[PDB]
Amino acid sequence: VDAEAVVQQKCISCHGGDLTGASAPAIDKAGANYSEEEILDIILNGQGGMPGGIAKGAEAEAVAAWLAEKK
Ligand code: HEC
Numbered sequence: 234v235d236a237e238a239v240v241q242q243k244c245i246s247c248h249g250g251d252l253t254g255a256s257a258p259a260i261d262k263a264g265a266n267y268s269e270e271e272i273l274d275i276i277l278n279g280q281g282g283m284p285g286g287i288a289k290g291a292e293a294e295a296v297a298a299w300l301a302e303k304k
Pocket residue numbers: 239240243244245246247248256257258260263271272275276280281282283284287288296
């Protein structure tokens with residue numbers, strides 16, 4: 234699953250187009266701040282106001298890895 238496409242259609246909804254942090258904090262650099270493990274769990278689980286489980290399996294895996302790679 235195209236990680237950037239996922240993020241660019243599942244996360245930008247709150248994080249904003251560039252993931253610079255609109256209705257949610259900036260995660261374009263979340264790969265710098267946190268590791269794929271952390272991010273993966275957060276995608277699967279949630280964070281604060283984030284519903285979580287927005288992406289799962291290959292979706293969330295691809296997301297987290299790509300996010301780690303975004304850094
Ligand atoms: C709006 C309903 C959200 C969607 C859709 C996604 N996220 Fe999110 N995320 C959101 C918020 C508001 C927060 C922080 C808590 C708060 O209430 O302010 C987050 C947090 C994350 C984090 C951690 C960032 C941090 O806590 O500093 C990550 C790594 C993250 N979110 C990733 C992420 C991805 C990749 C999503 C799409 C699969 C996604 N989020 C959707 C709000 C929302």
